[PDB]
Symmetry: C3
Subunit: 149 residues, 3 copies
């Protein structure tokens, strides 16, 4: 049995979000299982982002790399802040947690905040954890990319 606790899960969440903040896009993608679903719903009061597997995320990372390859200073500096992590369930080595988050983002003169809640299912059966499903609720919805969430 793999014994996985909240601290193990938090360590993974901190690493995953660090890989975005540090623009380590390939390492970041490797935190996701090839069959990972990634879903940020719209508020109907149609998703903001939906990918049924990781390929969609790979393509989006390709777009980000392409945009950045021409781009000059100032860059966008981001800082993820993962809070209030609660374990919801475990099914074998697949662990489901929810958490609140607040990403601060800065380029040049202006700071932007994005905040909300996320639910992750994470497969700990391999030597490195792998996200099986990501669900993101953006609360300040009225652009946003994957490196903000």
């Amino acid at each position: 049995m793999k014994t996985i606790d909240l601290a193990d899960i938090q360590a993974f969440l901190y690493r995953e979000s660090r890989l975005l903040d540090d623009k380590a896009w390939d390492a970041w993608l490797d935190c996701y299982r090839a069959d990972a679903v990634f879903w940020m719903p719209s508020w109907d009061d149609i998703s903001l982002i939906y990918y049924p597997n990781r390929q969609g995320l790979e393509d989006r990372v390709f777009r980000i790399k392409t945009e950045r390859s021409s781009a000059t200073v100032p860059d966008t500096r981001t800082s993820h802040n993962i809070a209030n992590v609660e374990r919801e369930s475990a099914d074998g080595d697949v662990h489901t947690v929810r958490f609140n988050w607040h990403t601060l983002s800065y380029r040049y003169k202006t700071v932007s905040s994005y905040f909300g809640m996320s639910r992750y299912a994470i497969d700990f059966s391999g030597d490195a954890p792998k996200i099986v499903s990501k669900y993101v609720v953006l609360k300040n919805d009225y652009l946003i990319d994957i490196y903000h969430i």
Copy 2:
């Protein structure tokens, strides 16, 4: 003996604040002992909120429900972020902790931040924890309701 550690306390703090963010007002009230004191002092440089028992909080929740029962979209979305949790004392099954917090709030176009420190005494003697005392220092004091703190 109930052995209660910081993680158990954090789990409770995350749940309590989640019940506000998710507008689960009755479940939220049940995190508080009937004799709970709830105090957010004013800065004299008279409280912003004071209740000597839970009844005052029940009445305030009634007011919130009444306001919401007519209200249309956009709603106010809140996100609590509990940080820097330190245990201060334990007396039997009553555990006292302090922590910093930052609630982000959004309706329509504008994000609001509230931040400060809180001290909780929490009774873990029952099957579910119960807040015995809540003290809240709002640092950006110059409105605010119970779902922001």
Copy 3:
């Protein structure tokens, strides 16, 4: 052997930052080894702060005390929020960690945010932990003092 885990490190980080938020300047200085190096680099796209030992920090605390000794209300209220703490290495009783942070600051009408990442090396060999090295990356760099970071 001193067994030190992430929770022990977090407890220390929370205390150290609390001593700044509560303006306990002498107690704060005592979280730092006399030979502590404190470095907040500039972005070259020359540091914002560099001290090769604690004396520089002592002198800066003296300046802060002098400024405050004449100053009237409203004061500046600060609130540190330490997030995403990851242990990087241990060498004997010296433990190195990185973390993200967001300090909120308020005086009078306006809230200011400072955010970024920090790396600490902390010596746990004595009865009280002592910072041996502090490195701070301020992401929203375009004033700031030691009580903001």
